[PDB]
Every structure is written in C-alpha cells, then in structure tokens.
Design an enzyme around this catalytic site. Structure first.
Site, short mmCIF file in Angstrom:
data_model
loop_
_atom_site.label_atom_id
_atom_site.label_comp_id
_atom_site.label_asym_id
_atom_site.label_seq_id
_atom_site.Cartn_x
_atom_site.Cartn_y
_atom_site.Cartn_z
N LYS A 1 -12.09 -3.72 1.59
CA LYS A 1 -11.51 -2.79 0.58
C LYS A 1 -12.30 -2.92 -0.72
CE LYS A 1 -7.24 -2.10 3.13
NZ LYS A 1 -5.99 -2.77 3.49
N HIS B 1 -5.05 -5.25 -1.07
CA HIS B 1 -5.09 -4.23 -2.10
C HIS B 1 -5.06 -4.84 -3.50
CE1 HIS B 1 -4.98 -0.60 0.38
NE2 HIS B 1 -4.09 -1.21 1.15
N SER C 1 0.81 -1.22 0.00
CA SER C 1 0.00 0.00 0.00
C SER C 1 0.84 1.27 0.00
CB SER C 1 -0.93 0.02 1.20
OG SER C 1 -0.21 0.25 2.39
#
Lengths: 399, 399
Positions: A246, A215, A187
């Site tokens: 997410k 991610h 990230s």
C-alpha cells in the site's frame, strides 16, 4: 448427470445469482502504470481515486530505479523459502530498517500482510489463550484467528466499553494469555483505532496489544510511522502486522514486527514463512529505498494530508454525507446499493474512477463510495474530480 | 508477573526447547543472485543444490530483462487488489497464457500458491461437500481445507486402495460434491502422484480431481506442462493450483487454473484474491517471458532430467539412503536432526550448499537433506558435489 458436472452447474447457478443481485465485480483492465491518472485498454483516461498508492511510490522514479538496481545486483527470483536459500542480505537489512521505523525489536518478512496475519495467531496462541478482535477487523485477521486454536471474542467496533466487557469475559473464562487485536485504520470507514485507550485498557488486564497497520504505515503519525505514533503509543505495541503493498511501494510483501522472541518463534513455526516463497529481491531493495525516502523527508505524507483536507472539505461543501475523520480514505455515504452503483458508474463516465461498497459487504442502508487520496494528485486535478462529484451528485439527487 | 510478560516467558521457553532438541533453523545470508553457485556474506562461494530454481530461470538474462521492461512500461507496484484498480493487461495476458500452457479454460492469479490453496476450498465447497486429501498434502492445502466447511477425509500416502475406501466412505456419509486433492509432486519426498489412476477412480465416483503443481509446472512431462502431462491426463484435471515462485521464475505469484466458471467464482469470492494485493507488474511480465522460453524449447527441462539421473545414480553408487523416485527432489534420509545439520554444515565446508530438513518441515525422526537438482549445473560441478557428499558421508558414518 455426473456429480462433477452438477458441481459445475451449481457454480454457474451461483454466478448468475450474483449477477442478478447486482453484486458482480467487473475488472477494468488498465494499460498504464499505476498513477494519479490511469488509462484502460479501451482508451478511457480517468483520475484514479481508489488506489492504495497513498504516497505515490507505486511509480516513483527512485523506487523504480532501486528495483532495477536490485535486479542487477540480486536477481529476479530466489525460488526458495527463507530457511533454505531464500535469505539475502537485502532481507536482513529490510527487517532491521522496518524494526527501527516501527519501534520494535525485530521484523519477519512475509509475501503479504494477508499471510502475515494468516501465519501469526496459530504460532503464538493456543486453546488456553484468547484473541479479542474489533468487530470490523480485516478478513485476513479473521482467517489467521480461525486457523489458530485461540478462544475468540469480538468487541463492538471502536467501542472501548465493550472491549472491557470482552476482556472481563475472557478473564472469567480462564484465558491464559490474551491478545487484543485491531486494524490500526479500518478501510471501510477510515476510522482510526483508539490505540491509546486500548493500550491503557490492555495494561489493566495484562493483555497484549496487536495492530494491523496496512492503511497506516508510511503516513499516519507526524513522521509517518503509523497509527501507534499518531496515538502516542509508539514503542508500546506488542505486535504490528503490515504490508509493503500500500503506502510503502505497492508491489508486494508484508511483515510482522514484535519483540525478538516472538519474531524468532515465527521464523521457526509460522506456516507461510516455512512453506511459501521468500520476498523477491527487487521488492526488498525497492522497499529499503522507500524507507530511505520516508526517513529523509515528511513531504510526501504532508502533501497527502493537505490533499485529504482539501477533498474532505470540498465534499462537505457540496453537501455529501462523509464519515467523520481526517484519513485519506474518504467514505461517501449513499445508503442504497443502487445509488452507489449509479454514482460509481456516472463518475467513471465523467473521468473519475472510484469503488462502491454495498450490501452484503456493508449493512443495508450503509452503501458508500470509497475515495482514497494520494500525494500524487495536484489540487487542480482534485478540483476537477470534485466538479464531477458535484455533477453526478446533483443528477442522482444526492446533493 | 503480568500475563503479558508471562506470555513472553512462554515464548522464550519454547524457543529454548527447540534449540535443546536440535530443531532450531538458522538462516544463511546470501550476498549474490540465485544461481548454480552462490556466495554468503562471509565470502564463501558454494554449489547450490537446494533451490526451487529447477530450470535456472530465477536469474536467466531474458527473464531479468522482461522484469526490467515491465518496470519501464507498467511501473513497480499497483497498490490495489485486482477488482478495484489492480488489473493490468499484463495480468490478463499471463492468465490466458497459463491456461493454454496448462490445458485449462482460465486462470486466476494469486500472490502465491499458498494463497491460491488458502482461497480455493472455502469458495467452491460447502458443509455438505467433501475433500479427500493425500495424507502428505502440503500445509497450504491443509490450511485451505481447514478454512472451508467441507468434510475432511485423508487417504494413505499415494495409496489408491485407501483412496477408494475414503471415496466410498464419503459417499456413504452423504457427500454432495467430492474433491480429491493431492500434491502433484510432494514437496518433501519428491514422489509423483498417481494422477492417471486417480482420474479413473474419480470418474467412477463422479468426483473432482485437483492437484497442487508447485514442484511440477515447467518441467514435469515431456513438454514440462506438469504432472498431469506426465501421467497422461493433460486436459482432464478439474483444478490446478500452482506457483510462479519455483521453476517458473522464482520471484513471487501463484495461480488456480480451472474451468471458466470456477475461475469466475474465485474472482468474485476468494478471500486472498479480494483482500490481498495484485501481483507486481514486473513479476507478471517476466512470467510471460518464462512461458515464451518454455514453449519454444524443452532443452532446460531435458537438461534437468539428465542432471537428476546422473546425481541420483551417483548418490546410489556412494551408498546413500535416498527416497525412491526420479524427481529432481532427491531426499537423502538421515532421520536424526543433529546429523542432518551436521551433514549440511560439513558439506558447506566442502563447497556444497544444502540445508537440513527437520520438524516441523518434515516429521520428527524423519530428518533429511532435500537435495534439488537444477538445469543450471554442468556435470563437472555435479561430480565435485558428489565427491563432497562421499567424503562428508564417510566422515559422518553415513555410508
């Protein structure tokens, strides 16, 4: 002075030092649902460029409707861990759907990816085993590793030569089983782990390969299955940990996906699974609807990809120092903590919400603004954001 | 044989040894919302006496509606940690309401009490400090302490004499700050920590007093505020960690409630707060409704107290081996894991849903059926369940 009150004085002293060093984190109180734009309680409306809402599912209408529907059919809370009375048919369906989506045999749900990682290593590895981590691995991975008795090794960030060195050293040290573990996408710099090279290197040493896909799941790879799909090693990953919080909806939940025997031992022994509440029914039901959406069409991740290209090209054109790559996480290097704090505050005044990272979270000279693209934004709004970057960047002497 | 495939052989061997020992947990798949009665996928409807649904709020219609409403007003997910863009006005409201409910200055939400404990000790304590734990403290407390650098001491379960010994030893060892920490109500035996005595003892040594209120908030004490209210030390607790996933709604979430500077430092530095998703808006909004309900009347916790007295008296009349106490957690001791699973299976056939507890959830040789009462049940259903316990217990040679 009592010891207890001295303790509170030392806490207050530490808080003041954080403030004086410019490190104090301020929570901006949002009044609206999450979205491409949000508005704080003081009425400031901003374009939101720092959410993990990669595919816009945090407030997608079919996701919200699946959540309403699961509240009606399966209730609000289960108030139980999975082994007692916290397993609904919803949970088994989601675990099977995630397994198929990710290319693994089975999946065990957790309250969060943080707890998936926390509950992973201690169950699977002991003192004779080794975990070999990318130096920039996520905090939750480190803490799961620290709770295990496993031998610890680190290789330099995305450095396949040093990974070999660590695998050699773990072998020389007499490791029984060895797990190479890395964020799939990091990230802080948006880099994509070299999973194809890591799989080949792991195979040379007989090592296991595990990844944290928080991610990545939903939009990495052609069908959005993850970094492993993007790197051509779909179905060749020993362990995937990940989040539902997410790209896959943004509410809560996480998971570990692996061979069926690993998942089975995790259900019997993983401490967050034994001793922490099951995932809420509405989040499970909405997550099944998320997978329905993403397996029906790649349009949302294709839109995210176009938005990412547009914004990376615009920042490049304006003259910013952008970390190379194609990921929706776009780190803009500004070197100094003060420059980063100034740029984030000026962008907020210009209607654009970003987050800055600086020493000691990143090294001296490595300060950055982290922007995150979403399928939600349209290119007109992104251009308006680029214009704000252009203005503030010229004002602060960055461009 | 590669090391990687040997790894899976090791996992499979361990799984087989669990099965051979009679310690393999199987999940029942519930098809209904949580409630006083549930139905598994095979269609069998049974009385649930093993949920943390102490006040019936997991499917209370006002709580479900508050979740629908927060979905409409604030969306499904926030897809952000709190400090970036994951703080809504709902979160601040819930934090204020919990602090008032609990008698503290401020509150910080976590995804779970497991995370609250995991992020507590490492943030507040250092290598010169000490934590003194009840020997039976919850796994999430232990893991939080292990992640910290604090020096660890244990006192014998609910033993105030030994607590003094440990405080004395920790002082002799040169501790700077000392935190005595205990379950408020212990998850597996239902015993109530002697917080009034512990507060006095802590004061003598200048120590801090922290409690994990997961099996207490909502229904312990005359107003259901917690163990500290029940023990007359409301407003005199340094740290409260707790869950929203048991009596307070049953969906997800947790918290640490403390003096304002402790909460502030946890927001700046607590790793599960910095690196895990914010609580979902629907769970925050429904938790606010939960506190509206519980602050308006004590009828639910009063009904729970009456049901518990009735059921403990019935189990005593029938001749069961029940841990002494008055808490809604009613541990029926069977010691042998096989007979625990046998009793739970026979009770299911007779219309009662309970689950066997055995290692690692409870110690080897100390297996049990953890019965949990709820405000939901009427006396007729509890009597039917008593009759089932009597018949199953006599069939199985237990009474």
């Amino acid at each position: 002075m009592s010891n207890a009150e001295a303790f509170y004085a030392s806490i207050r002293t530490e808080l003041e030092s954080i403030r004086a060093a410019g490190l104090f984190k301020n929570e901006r109180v949002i009044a609206t649902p999450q979205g491409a734009r949000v508005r704080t309680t003081d009425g400031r409306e901003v374009i939101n460029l720092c959410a993990n809402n990669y595919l816009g599912l945090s407030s997608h209408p079919q996701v919200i409707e699946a959540a309403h529907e699961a509240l009606r059919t399966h209730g609000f809370g289960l108030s139980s861990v999975r082994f007692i009375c916290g397993t609904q048919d919803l949970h088994k369906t989601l675990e099977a759907r995630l397994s198929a989506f990710l290319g693994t045999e089975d999946t065990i749900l957790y309250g969060s990816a943080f707890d998936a990682n926390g509950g992973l290593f201690e169950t699977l590895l002991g003192a004779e085993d080794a975990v070999i981590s990318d130096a920039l691995n996520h905090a939750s991975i480190i803490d799961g590793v620290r709770l295990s008795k496993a031998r610890r090794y680190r290789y330099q960030h995305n450095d396949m030569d040093d990974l070999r060195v660590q695998l050699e050293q773990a072998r020389a040290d007499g490791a029984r089983y060895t797990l190479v573990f890395s964020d799939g996408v990091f990230s802080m710099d948006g880099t994509v782990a070299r999973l194809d090279e890591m799989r080949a290197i792991c195979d040379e040493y007989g090592a296991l390969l595990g990844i944290d896909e928080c991610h990545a799941t939903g939009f990495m790879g052609q069908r959005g299955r993850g970094t492993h799909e993007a790197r051509g090693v779909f179905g060749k990953i020993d362990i995937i940990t990940g989040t539902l919080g997410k790209a896959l909806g943004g509410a809560s939940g996480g998971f570990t996906s692996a061979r069926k025997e690993v998942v089975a031992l995790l259900r019997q022994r993983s401490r967050p699974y034994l001793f922490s509440n099951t995932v809420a029914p509405a989040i499970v039901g909405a997550s099944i609807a998320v997978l329905d959406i993403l397996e029906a069409s790649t349009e949302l991740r294709d839109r995210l990809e176009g938005n990412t290209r547009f914004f990376r090209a615009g920042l490049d054109r304006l003259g910013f120092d952008v970390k190379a790559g194609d990921h929706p996480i776009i780190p803009i290097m500004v070197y100094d903590a003060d420059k980063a704090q100034q740029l984030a505050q000026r962008l907020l005044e210009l209607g654009v919400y970003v987050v800055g990272f600086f020493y000691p979270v990143v090294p001296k000279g490595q300060a950055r603004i982290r922007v995150q693209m979403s399928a939600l934004h349209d290119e007109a709004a992104l251009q308006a954001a680029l214009d704000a970057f252009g203005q503030a960047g010229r004002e602060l002497g960055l461009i």
